[model samples]
Target: MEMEKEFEQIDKSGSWAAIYQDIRHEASDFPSRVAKLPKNKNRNRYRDVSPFDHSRIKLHQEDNDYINASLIKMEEAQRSYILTQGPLPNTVGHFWEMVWEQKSRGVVMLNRVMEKGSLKCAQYWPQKEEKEMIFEDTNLKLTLISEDIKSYYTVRQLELENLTTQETREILHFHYTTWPDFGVPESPASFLNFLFKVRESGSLSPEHGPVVVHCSAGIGRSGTFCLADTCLLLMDKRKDPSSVDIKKVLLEMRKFRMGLIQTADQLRFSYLAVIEGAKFIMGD
Candidate 1:
């Protein structure tokens, strides 16, 4: 269905509220094998932010350290994304550990370091002139290769190194600076443009590990990003754009990642983005 019709019907049928509520209901009820353990529990940035046991990503062969990340896959779209919380000052090592262990080629950041004067996330990537950073706890190193600033987003090329093996690989950083929490962007045009920019990098391809995507809590804007991107790709793969059911697809994607779309408004915005992005795909 097109954007408006889906919005109208979803509103009239109260399906949006139902979907939002179902997500909240199941979010905390899901068990976490590591949540009960002190070693892993202390590693979590937020006490409440724990990955569901089934979808949680395990750290290196070293026994356990919960990193507040989940491996979400939509096999039908041949796409996978690691939805994770914004790394805290302490979890920085664990974050890069995930990048190194998962072999992720990109990090998609949706929130600013500070939101409304409050620190939302740590400066996980290096500053402009700061060349390299080493995570002592995990034996990982990150070096800044280059940074491309844009109207709405900034893309950075960084080298992720395994300090243990002296091995290194480049990783792309796609940071969207304008998106608001629990809300949408100014327009779908800018958002879709950023989406396509990441697409052009070829990092989201299946040949590589799943790209890491996150905002503060990892559910609100992060969920919208994945949903819109997948829906547009599905349209491009098939000959038909209208055949893609955004809601149904989102429901399926949420099975792997809790609370894929955060709010009714976020859900609304996601439909708008997918609808706008489909224009580009259909035109191609």
Candidate 2:
């Protein structure tokens, strides 16, 4: 009752902007001192977007521990997510090193390397032809072992190796290739389909490290993905799906990573996708 009616009433009343304003007011004002440091400045893709020092993922390295990433944990849903920006060209090695250290099972990339006639993210993984990418700084080698392409997303199997130890692990790369430029997906059904595919892979379980999720800035589309994913899981477990308060869920999520659900449209889309997703979860 609450879940369906809240958005509908808000939509009918045309109050999305007002609701978003409240969210923004409540979500803003977190400290990001590490992202603003002189030595760590180049590590960030966007000037304003930065992970909070408290929640940001810290590397075990001695010299520089900064990475534009945060670990968002939802205990009720038993989900842990690493929300982060798309890697800069210079920080690609650090990006993989974070994954290696975190022991993440998969990566959910929402933005393409190039979007709107510009580069939004670094080409961190190698192309199929390139087959392998070696990050000498981090002593990691990423090999593209398999590729399964769909119209909207691609699932690639990558082998991550510690060149020093000669130990290897498999990583699933789930790239959503069709997200509209500077906007959300074309529809909730397609987005939910892509999301469920990721879920079924078992990458989201607590058994593994937090799944690393990123878009251009890491807070917009990345936040939307994690928000919807968490709400849907909670809905699945609850006796009444409506008991899942999406706004509250997103608020809790924003605590770990700031500026989640970048726009009113994105927030609206999250609600719709969660509603659509609950149908399938309940039916199954």
Candidate 3:
């Protein structure tokens, strides 16, 4: 059950495709009644990527609680992540409402607003000139205070205000802009660097609500992030780097939401990241 050796064995066995396909086949095909409702259907960015009824995060708005989001939990690792689709034009408010309601300290966005000439996600946050974006429905206002742009990603400082309660909180927005759609990062080192940056914010801890993790459909890249992070944590907890099973951990995550880790390449990338990240968790 050595993590790296097992992945190499699977890689050399020429069964990587079969293993990934089986994971997709074996994942829970749970009911998504709310996501299918006529009122909620348009909220979904993709036709097939819907959050399951059992684990979908419900909004305070009783009449319309659907938002194409699922709260994924790895109870053993004490990690909770909200895997969700990129916000649609109409669902932008609901997206932040979920952030406010859920008490999420940071938003870990894994995709860009546009990709390869197509709109992948709504420009949900305010630009420099706009200063603030208001959600009338939630009575929340998000003001962009500053941004630190890097070559591959951008770190944003946002001030979230509940216009109703007059209460405010600072939310960190970590955007890994260079990760392509349906593809992994340039390298595990680069990906892990960003992951560690997010971790340094202390947003991933239980002290805060689950950090919201989303890509375009919130499955492929998002799943890879959760899988790698959780596996490393599991490894750290047991004080043994090889004590975790990546496949088993992924299966557990898929129960909360369907179609996680979309491509075989993404699955491979998760393994790479976990293998690289274990070094830090296990210490230098």
Candidate 4:
């Protein structure tokens, strides 16, 4: 089935700016998380380094307003949190620590995927230091799981060298058209299957600890993966499963974390790719 005609160019910068503006206009609709400590409590600790300055961080009034509203909802109600995958900024980390410090069931880290072998990723989090800092410093436990999709390059290259032509053909057949009709070779169905296998194998779960996933900036591929997961969960709950709203989901995500897909191409592609995958699976 053909997809509904989407807006020609849903640019991220433009969309983000518009969303931020909306948040700004409704600033009063939002509230903020109350800091447990007195405002001046941390003055002495970091006073020597430099006074904290929020001037550089762009503040969309509407975004701030929505964050305020969302924080209130989070505070008054008990709801599972959804976060983008990757190492958080120091400010974000501090905020999370402040919020979850005394709470018994709260989660601290929820990274999407940890690539330990990548030299670039390793440089940011050295193996020894990750053990000391990520594992030791936080209350969260690290649940390590390897997804075959993530290991695409390693496995495919190895197969090219070692496997017989017939064996290779069998593997390639599964790999080439496993996903949706989108231009991408790999489909969401295959990716979800990989995640389900990991879950069933006892390698990953929310109970073990916050799942850490990272792909560079934590905005493009990582964000899209998370959005898809959230959408799938919602789809499971609705009586009319076909009526799930993708735009609403994306808007809700942006309320907490700004600039989900920083580029226009990524923003449009991620939505189309996942929706395409969904349609392929649902046979719509």
Question: Whole-model Cα lDDT per candidate?
Answer: 0.82, 0.89, 0.88, 0.34
lDDT, candidate 3, 12-114, per-residue tens: 9977789899888887778988888887768988988888999999999867777889999788899999999999899999999999999999999988788
Which candidate achieves the best lDDT against the true structure? 2
Total backbone clashes of candidate 3, pairs 3 or more residues apart or in separate chains: 0
Indicate whether candidate 3 or candidate 4 has the larger TM-score: 3
Local distance difference test, candidate 3: 0.88
Residue 58, model 1: Cα distance from true site in angstroms = 0.4
Q: Pull out the clashing pairs in model 3.
A: none
lDDT for model 1? 0.82
lDDT minimum window of 10 residues, candidate 4? 65-74
> Where is model 2 more than 4 Å wrong at Cα?
none
In what order do the candidates fall by TM-score, top score first? 2, 3, 1, 4
What candidate 4 gets wrong by more than 4 Å, as runs, is 1-209, 279-284
Between candidates 2 and 3, the one scoring higher on lDDT is 2
Task: Give the runs in model 1 whose Cα sits over 4 Å from its true position.
Answer: 1-3, 10-19, 22-29
Instruction: Write down the RMSD of all candidates, one decimal each.
Output: 2.4, 1.3, 1.4, 13.9
Top-TM-score candidate index: 2
lDDT for model 4, on a 0 to 1 scale?
0.34
